[PDB]
Amino acid sequence: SDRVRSITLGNSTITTQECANVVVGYGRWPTYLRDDEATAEDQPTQPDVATCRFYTLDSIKWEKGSVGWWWKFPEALSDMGLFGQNMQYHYLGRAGYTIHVQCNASKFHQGCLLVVCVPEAEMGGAVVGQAFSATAMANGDKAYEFTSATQSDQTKVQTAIHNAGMGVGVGNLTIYPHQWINLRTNNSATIVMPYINSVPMDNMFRHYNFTLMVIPFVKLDYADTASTYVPITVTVAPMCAEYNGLRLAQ
Amino acid sequence: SDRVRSITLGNSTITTQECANVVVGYGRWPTYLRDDEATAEDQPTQPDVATCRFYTLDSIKWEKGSVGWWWKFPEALSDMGLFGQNMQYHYLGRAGYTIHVQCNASKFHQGCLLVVCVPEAEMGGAVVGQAFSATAMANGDKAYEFTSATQSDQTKVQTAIHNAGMGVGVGNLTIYPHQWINLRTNNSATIVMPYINSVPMDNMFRHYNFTLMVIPFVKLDYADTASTYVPITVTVAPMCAEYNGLRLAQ
Amino acid sequence: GDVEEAIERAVVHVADTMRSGPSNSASVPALTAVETGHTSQVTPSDTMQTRHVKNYHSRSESTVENFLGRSACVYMEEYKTTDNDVNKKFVAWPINTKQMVQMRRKLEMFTYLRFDMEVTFVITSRQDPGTTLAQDMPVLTHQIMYVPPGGPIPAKVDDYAWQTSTNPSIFWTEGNAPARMSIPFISIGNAYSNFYDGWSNFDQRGSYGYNTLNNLGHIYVRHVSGSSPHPITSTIRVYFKPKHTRAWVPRPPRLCQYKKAFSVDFTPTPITDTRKDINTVT
Amino acid sequence: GDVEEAIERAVVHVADTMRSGPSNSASVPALTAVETGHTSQVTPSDTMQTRHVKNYHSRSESTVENFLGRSACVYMEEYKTTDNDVNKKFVAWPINTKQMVQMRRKLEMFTYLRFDMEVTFVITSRQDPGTTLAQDMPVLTHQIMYVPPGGPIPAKVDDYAWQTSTNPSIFWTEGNAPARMSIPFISIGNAYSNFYDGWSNFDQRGSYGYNTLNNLGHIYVRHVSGSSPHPITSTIRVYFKPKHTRAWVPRPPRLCQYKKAFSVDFTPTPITDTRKDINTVT
Amino acid sequence: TTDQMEMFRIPVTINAPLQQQVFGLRLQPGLDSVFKHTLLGEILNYYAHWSGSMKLTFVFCGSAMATGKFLIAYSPPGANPPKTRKDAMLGTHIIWDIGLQSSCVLCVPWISQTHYRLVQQDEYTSAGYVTCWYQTGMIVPPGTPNSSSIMCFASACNDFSVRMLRDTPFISQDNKL
Amino acid sequence: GAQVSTQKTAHEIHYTNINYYKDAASNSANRQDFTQDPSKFTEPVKDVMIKSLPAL
Amino acid sequence: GAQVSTQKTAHEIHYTNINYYKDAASNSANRQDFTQDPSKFTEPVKDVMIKSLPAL
Ligand SMILES: CN1CCN(Cc2ccc(NCc3ccc(F)c(F)c3)cc2)CC1
Numbered sequence A, B: 001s002d003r004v005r006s007i008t009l010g011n012s013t014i015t016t017q018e019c020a021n022v023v024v025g026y027g028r029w030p031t032y033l034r035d036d037e038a039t040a041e042d043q044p045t046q047p048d049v050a051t052c053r054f055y056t057l058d059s060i061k062w063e064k065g066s067v068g069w070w071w072k073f074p075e076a077l078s079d080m081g082l083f084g085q086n087m088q089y090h091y092l093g094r095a096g097y098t099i100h101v102q103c104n105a106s107k108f109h110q111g112c113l114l115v116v117c118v119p120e121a122e123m124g125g126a127v128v129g130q131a132f133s134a135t136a137m138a139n140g141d142k143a144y145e146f147t148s149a150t151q152s153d154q155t156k157v158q159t160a161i162h163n164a165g166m167g168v169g170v171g172n173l174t175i176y177p178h179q180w181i182n183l184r185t186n187n188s189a190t191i192v193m194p195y196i197n198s199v200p201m202d203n204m205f206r207h208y209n210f211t212l213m214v215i216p217f218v219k220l221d222y223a224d225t226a227s228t229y230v231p232i233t234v235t236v237a238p239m240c241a242e243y244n245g246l247r248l249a250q
Numbered sequence C, D: 001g002d003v004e005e006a007i008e009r010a011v012v013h014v015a016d017t018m019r020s021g022p023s024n025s026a027s028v029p030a031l032t033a034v035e036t037g038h039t040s041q042v043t044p045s046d047t048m049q050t051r052h053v054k055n056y057h058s059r060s061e062s063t064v065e066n067f068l069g070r071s072a073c074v075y076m077e078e079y080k081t082t083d084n085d086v087n088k089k090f091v092a093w094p095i096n097t098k099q100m101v102q103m104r105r106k107l108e109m110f111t112y113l114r115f116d117m118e119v120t121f122v123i124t125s126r127q128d129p130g131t132t133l134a135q136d137m138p139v140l141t142h143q144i145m146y147v148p149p150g151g152p153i154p155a156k157v158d159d160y161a162w163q164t165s166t167n168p169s170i171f172w173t174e175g176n177a178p179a180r181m182s183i184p185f186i187s188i189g190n191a192y193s194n195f196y197d198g199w200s201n202f203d204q205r206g207s208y209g210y211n212t213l214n215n216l217g218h219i220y221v222r223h224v225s226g227s228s229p230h231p232i233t234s235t236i237r238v239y240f241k242p243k244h245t246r247a248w249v250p251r252p253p254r255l256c257q258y259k260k261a262f263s264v265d266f267t268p269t270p271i272t273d274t275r276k277d278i279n280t281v282t
Numbered sequence E: 001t002t003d004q005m006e007m008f009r010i011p012v013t014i015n016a017p018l019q020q021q022v023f024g025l026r027l028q029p030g031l032d033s034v035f036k037h038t039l040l041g042e043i044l045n046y047y048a049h050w051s052g053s054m055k056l057t058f059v060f061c062g063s064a065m066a067t068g069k070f071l072i073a074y075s076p077p078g079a080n081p082p083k084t085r086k087d088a089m090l091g092t093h094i095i096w097d098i099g100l101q102s103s104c105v106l107c108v109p110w111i112s113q114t115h116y117r118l119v120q121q122d123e124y125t126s127a128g129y130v131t132c133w134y135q136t137g138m139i140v141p142p143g144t145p146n147s148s149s150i151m152c153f154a155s156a157c158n159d160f161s162v163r164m165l166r167d168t169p170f171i172s173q174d175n176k177l
Numbered sequence F, G: 001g002a003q004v005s006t007q008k009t010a011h012e013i014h015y016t017n018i019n020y021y022k023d024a025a026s027n028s029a030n031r032q033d034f035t036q037d038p039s040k041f042t043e044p045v046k047d048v049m050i051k052s053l054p055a056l
């Protein structure tokens, strides 16, 4: 059977007994930087195993009125194990990721989720011509809430769901790498995202490589059961991570 | 000329323009653990470069009345860069060291130091039949003072210099790997210490692998100069370090 | 043919550990199903990255031959050189391995056994307390006699039965090394049985349990001719040491304390000790 | 294969002395620099004229095997055959080599050791003084029992634990040669450690020093069944004799007198004795 | 435990906080009360030294319609045992998914500074801790029991071994039978 | 008629034995055998199961 | 299976040994080894120094 998948990174393992295939970015597997493409001179550091492992990033609660959530990487893993320490102590970094989003419910539940990784997901402010701090869009591993109605507070990003906070039709996000979690026939989605950027390496504190979005297209529904909500969990694992430019800790 | 030495570990370099040879433990160079000698099952982690580099461990002041000092390893490097983090996050560790002790003075100064690494340097309490805490013998990178007179406080180790706090003649420490810093003809001492222990690996928080001692056999002397003291600095660098048994941070 | 030169047994070391790297596939060694009654054969190499390790450990000391190859006391008794009661001047012990607890528990881990036996006797003497003790006595001598089932049994120290003509016996003198002998496999069946879930009579009546199959005989001991002016007490200890052992059908070790020498009777016991709660680890 | 004929080890004699004549050159063997931590390798032939000498001396007696290959007392204790105090009728000694000073100092010249052990027991008895001593007692017998860590421990002379079924034991009778046994290398680590600069708990708390690694077990001794009308006292001495020895990391010999059996505690001592002045030679 | 058989059942509930501990124990196979009397523990108590890896197998004995995920982690020796899932997940662990296969195996690797460990374990030769935490929680449909149970099995791998035979302390007598 | 065989010792040695009695029960313990097979108690199933493959 | 070897004696002689027990720990002390090497403690330097040449 092809409905069972097992992934082993570092000293952690993920087993899903009911899942689809594994989308693989734009058909490119993560890999180390080549000699003929690099620019920095000094020797890089490659702490595999220590950093290439799965890290569960907290958990959200899916209610009948949920609208969606997003996380921004790699800042989401800023304080997660040796990955965070290496990112703090180095000027440059580079790594792909494997994203696994779990969500299980009985045969009598119905709903559908969209899981998508949006590279360079620039967002606009709630009030045009008004700047916002770096706290209404990323504050560690905590998830951020979309809003059904138009946002009004000037200190946070425009959370209108149907525009995805990017000024584009939400239904067109299918262009990016993605998967669907349909409670009828699925329990998890796996995405392998290679390193996508305009330069060989970049600082991980100043640049958000890509954004993860979970949007319920078909709202959750059930009847006559003792379960009131469906927990959702997100797990990530850097792959082929290498750092460079050792400096004092930020 | 053989009076000039240069050592390059990781991203750090040490250059001494006036030095002796380099003592090399019991004639054994540091090396990784072999497959036929290991006992732990899981894959080890080998973060070379990130951990195999020189770390300056504070500085002491050599006065006319100084008696000596000691440091205990690897606890001395407990909070020094990624080495400390790796030691915290792992149950087992293993690594050799390269110790470099600098001390420079004009041609008109006189004095002699003994630099020696004592493996398993067990020490006795100041008052017989009285226990002491793990603070009178190691508190990080700070150096500890020997005493010319017999110690009397019951909360600290016996610091009588002539017995080395070990119940043995101080003049017999030559048996261990060592070097002399004679101000006439020397400025630094270099010692390469392989991993010595009764087991393949051990925890670095519970076991003091070896102790470093600096003892002035000929007290410092000078006359009619504006310099009042001769600073002494110690630099260490783990070699072929590998860790195992990942656990939550201590 | 001055030397045979037995070939080496070839030290059997335990299995090594093979290097393993990251994996991502449909194989799931971790997942199994205990309902089949089959114990999983996974190894640490199948769930986390591991280095290559050569193990030189061996399981030599865990063999049944070595596990049971230790002498253990199985019985001790006292008899006096001179006394008013005739029955108190000699010992009569029906052979059985259920008297002493440790050796019993060791044996009871297997249902069936087959081995040779090595028997050693330790004998000591002491002068009984009394008002007058000044006496001179030469060294004492003791006789051990083995009576297979159905043979004549002595009724007093100076009985005619002590003139063994077919019954093996040992005469021993104090001050020398302990006596010893070897005994072959003397079971009517194909193996000794520690347990027997059955009756004696064909109508399911009579004796029940392992007491039915115990017909190994008796052992008698006495002072040869010592008869002191004042009482002297002696003690004998019997040690058994199996050799060339084979075992079958292992069973779980006993948990409740023994209470009878010829029965499995016991009192209910808690499974194990308790702790504060399911999370306490201190 | 009636004879193997082990090849000769080839007596290794010390270095000879080569003839040397007058010299006048730029080579200066005498001058060196101890700052390197390197001991000079000069010989008398390098500083004065010498004749040719063939040395037949050998360093056979200075090998570690021979240096440590001598039996030495490590413990002695007394126990009575009969007395009011139960604890006084048997011995219970936790095994350790730090009790007796000479053997301790000999061992403490090396940080790590690995050897087989040969153990010998010397037992003697004597009648306690008293008003009435006229009694007659046969020869006594003694039992030595070794209890690995975690095993049951007897609480009285006639306890059930004395029925060893797995614990090795020796039964010995007075008047014969001393008892003896051989013990292999039984350390959990790769070598015995005389010193241990570390703690027990992972937070640098608890027991400190070599006391942490001492888990070799216990030894118990008792009179088998001797119970005299009048007290009799016995003494046992234990002797250890390493075999097949290997040593690592030599350390300077101790200078200050020992004061504790499980610690390195000491009192400061002068380096050495004194004389009238730096020139006195008488 | 008024009923002795309860000692073999690990409770599990439908509604629990997002991260919660299911159980925790010390890894002292020959000394800890949990492993003291198991089929494995009995054998070790006849010896003084032991080494090798261990297997812990968990079987979910809930309903067929129930589902959930669990995190089982092994923490090597340290100054303090884990208190929250974030601490536990740092060490060796496996994410267990409940489906058609009702059993999962956690292989405890042999990580030690010495080739052997004492059966009568102490601070020097500690072995670590094992804990289990809710990964997602247990969900059930209508008309099912609100509680379930889990069972644990212990066994030794193929590299396990023992040394130094010693008399067990569990069995004793005061008088001849 | 003497037998020569190796004696237990890591990777760093012969002893001679002769039998004096006419009964095999008198021989010394043959504690040099180390062959073993646990599949009898661990894999008593009828159909062999591959660890990699699913149990059912 | 007997071993024959020389016994210690200047320049002016065989003994036979047989092992009776099945454990190597029972053998007699092997005090006939005389190989030794002091360079480990006397010359632990990295660069070899010739005695005739100056130390520095
Ligand atoms: C029911 N079986 C009886 C045998 N028992 C083991 C056993 C077997 C034989 C003996 N002793 C045999 C023996 C040996 C030497 C003698 F001199 C003698 F009289 C008898 C002791 C225990 C297991 C349970």
Ligand SMILES: CN1CCN(Cc2ccc(NCc3ccc(F)c(F)c3)cc2)CC1
Residues within 6 Å of the ligand: D095, D096, D097, D117, D119, D146, D147, D183, D192, D193, D194, D210, D213, D214, D216, D217, D218, D219, D240
């Ligand atoms: C911490 N180590 C403990 C061992 N000690 C040396 C040593 C080792 C073993 C022994 N005796 C082993 C032994 C030998 C024979 C026995 F019967 C017995 F119970 C124990 C004595 C001293 C050095 C310091």
